[PDB]
Write a structure and sequence with these properties.
Elements lengths: L4 H10 L10 H12 L6 E3 L5 E3 L4 E2 L29 H11 L9 H7 L14
Antiparallel strand pairs: 1-2, 2-3
Helix pairs in contact: 1-2, 2-4
């Protein structure tokens, strides 16, 4: 599923991401834009041999099991393919754990490099308040 921007904002809000660990909703929409281009099916193999999965590009070395990543810890206790669903629930539940770790949203490289320090409110322009 390729989400509309405001559609994803609504879905993320429904799941309580707005202001989760202090990160306003625009941060989460911005992250998803630059991590997956709002595409739940997005997968990207990493140089390290892990793969990033879904709307928020959750990694197979630490967070989910994809059956092919050496050193997999599976801290979210989920198959990585579950993170590709049109239903973002599993991705959100795992993101909540991820963002609760020491570095916060800095774990998402696209957030750190493209969203952090910018006017992230722009990413929810037009979306129901
Ligand atoms: Na992999």
């Amino acid at each position: 599923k390729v989400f509309g921007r405001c559609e994803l904002a609504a879905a993320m809000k429904r799941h309580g991401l707005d202001n989760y660990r202090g990160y306003s909703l625009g941060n989460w929409v911005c992250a998803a834009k630059f991590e997956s281009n709002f595409n739940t099916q997005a997968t990207n193999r990493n140089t390290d041999g892990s793969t990033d999965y879904g709307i928020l590009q959750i990694n197979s070395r630490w967070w989910c099991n994809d059956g092919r990543t050496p050193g997999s810890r599976n801290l979210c206790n989920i198959p990585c393919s579950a993170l590709l669903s049109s239903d973002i629930t599993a991705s959100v539940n795992c993101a909540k754990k991820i963002v609760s770790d020491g570095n916060g949203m800095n774990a998402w490289v696209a957030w750190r490099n493209r969203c952090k320090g910018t006017d992230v409110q722009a990413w929810i322009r037009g979306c129901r308040l």
